Design a protein around this ligand. Sequence first.
Ligand code: JXX
Ligand code: MG
Ligand code: ZN
Length: 315
Amino acid sequence: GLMQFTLPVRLCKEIELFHFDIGPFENMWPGIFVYMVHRSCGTSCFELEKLCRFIMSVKKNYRRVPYHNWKHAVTVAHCMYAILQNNHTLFTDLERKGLLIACLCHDLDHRGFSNSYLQKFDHPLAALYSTSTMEQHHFSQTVSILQLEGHNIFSTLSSSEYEQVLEIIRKAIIATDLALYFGNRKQLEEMYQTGSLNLNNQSHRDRVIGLMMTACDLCSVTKLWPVTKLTANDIYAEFWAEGDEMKKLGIQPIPMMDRDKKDEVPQGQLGFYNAVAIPCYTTLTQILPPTEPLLKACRDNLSQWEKVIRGEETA
Ligand SMILES: Clc1nc(N2CCOCC2)c2ccccc2n1
Ligand SMILES: [Mg+2]
Ligand SMILES: [Zn+2]
């Protein structure tokens, strides 16, 4: 257990910042994740051999889609790492173990299509799971991989710690369903403002962990503008494919997803920062003040999209 992962100096320092980009070298992403587990959790949280086999099985079960890919998995885990590191004493040992694994697993076997597209297609997964269709699948895929031989990174936990962590992971992965985000944040807003928010109340923690999951999941909008902008193209490449597939089912897609209406992208990103991103990091910053850099970066990027619209730069 005397075997640290270390990172080159520039990464060793930048990985601690919310806005860290994990880079274009895929073969370093596993080592970045282990590094984060070792500092966030301990070098003892997981048997390294089991962790490495688990990481590589998770990687293998992410597909080669423009956005909802292995890089998104590690990026979202890194944002959670930064939240946990900036809020040291607020989370249990089980929560630190669970949430980085939840983040790495949260989009397992994603095909680049929304819950909506599965329902209009009449995909079998839409029959098996009527709401949070892809997210119940992602959790399903996580449990499958935990059950491959040699892959039970939790095997040293007690029976009841095992149940607690898998339950943290399931809520955390379900919370990445943006349809559940709006009510979750509204509730957290009221509880914070009326002063009823209580982190010893498990159902309140669940809510707070769900909003962190949304914050980590959307964290593309909290990068430096050049990362945010280039990622938006991957995001839109999936939307346009979905739009195409909607048109093949005989359904005019929403204009966000229509590759004939690319002109409307900047105004669509404005709606998204205003309806989703800014509210998310605002309430998150209210509950966890050290996460403010996420809100500040998100505001900077809103202002960068306003500049794209005012023709003061292009896409
Ligand atoms: Cl319009 C839009 N949707 C996003 N997400 C909604 C659907 O799940 C996938 C991602 C998004 C996520 C991050 C950054 C900008 C984004 N912009
Ligand atoms: Mg998802
Ligand atoms: Zn995601």
